[PDB]
Amino acid sequence: PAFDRDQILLHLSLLRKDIATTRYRAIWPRREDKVKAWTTPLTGATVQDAVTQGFNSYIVVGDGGDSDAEITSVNAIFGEWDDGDLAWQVGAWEACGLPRPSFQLRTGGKSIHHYWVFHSPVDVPAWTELQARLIALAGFDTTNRNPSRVMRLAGCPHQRTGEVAQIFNATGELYDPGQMLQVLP
Ligand SMILES: [Ca+2]
């Protein structure tokens, strides 16, 4: 196998997602090659094919499909800083006044990914407001704001370096969206 299946399933598990309905996106690393992204169900055979061909690996975090209109709920808010010392990125949520992430993800690239997982799926309007407030308070990359946003998948390589994305600092904690709305301005 060209990927770590345990990390893939752990990513889905921590997001309380169902592999049968999870959407995979394979994106070519070099913009100038103008290679079409794959949009397909997440399966081991498809990830195997995309990784060995040279694609980077992503999943749609929200549930329902590939476009914003197809998303009916999202199980987590999440974000990343565009840059900054990596070690600083791991802990910088604390100085922002954010609660501790449910888990974090090392991508192999320039950013740590932070996730806060809710106990129940969140409808798109409520989720959209929480995600926007999270971006504002932390100063995250403002690109990652739409309900069909894809995020780097754990257990697959960052193709530029070969480093395999890894989940770390999982706590098991689940947040409540109403409580989160109070702590996020
Ligand atoms: Ca809790």
Numbering used by the authors: 6 to 190
Copy text verbatim from the article accompanying this structure deposition:
Among them, cyanophage S-2L is unique because its genome has all its adenines (A) systematically replaced by 2-aminoadenines (Z). Here, we identify the enzyme that is responsible for genome duplication of the phage S-2L, a member of the PrimPol family, and we present its crystal structure. We give a structural explanation for both the specificity and the reaction mechanism of DatZ, based on three crystallographic structures, including one determined at sub-angstrom resolution.
The first region (1–190) corresponds to the AEP domain itself, with all crucial motifs conserved. All crucial residues cluster together in the catalytic site of the domain. Y63, E85, D87, T112, K115, H118, D146, R157 are conserved across all AEPs (or have biochemically similar counterparts), and their function is well established in the superfamily. Residues E85, D87 (that can vary to Asp and Glu, respectively) coordinate a divalent metal ion (M2+) in the B site, that positions the triphosphate of the incoming nucleotide (dNTP) during polymerisation; this triphosphate is further stabilised by interactions with T112, K115, H118 and R157 (possibly varying respectively to Ser, Arg, Asn and Lys). Residue D146 along with residues E85, D87 and the dNTP’s α-phosphate coordinate another M2+ ion in the A site, making it possible to add the incoming dNTP to the primer strand of the nascent nucleic acid through the two-metal-ion mechanism. Importantly, in S-2L PP-N190 we noticed a significant positional shift of residue D87 compared to other AEP structures, along with the conservation among the close relatives of the neighbouring residue D88, which is exposed to the solvent. In all cases, the catalytic site is open to the solvent and there is no selection on the incoming nucleotides; after superposition with these structures, PP-N190 presents no structural feature that could lead to a Z vs A specificity during the polymerase reaction. Due to the presence of divalent calcium ions in all crystallisation conditions, we could not soak the crystals with nucleotides which immediately precipitate; transferring crystals to a solution devoid of Ca2+ dissolved them in a matter of seconds.
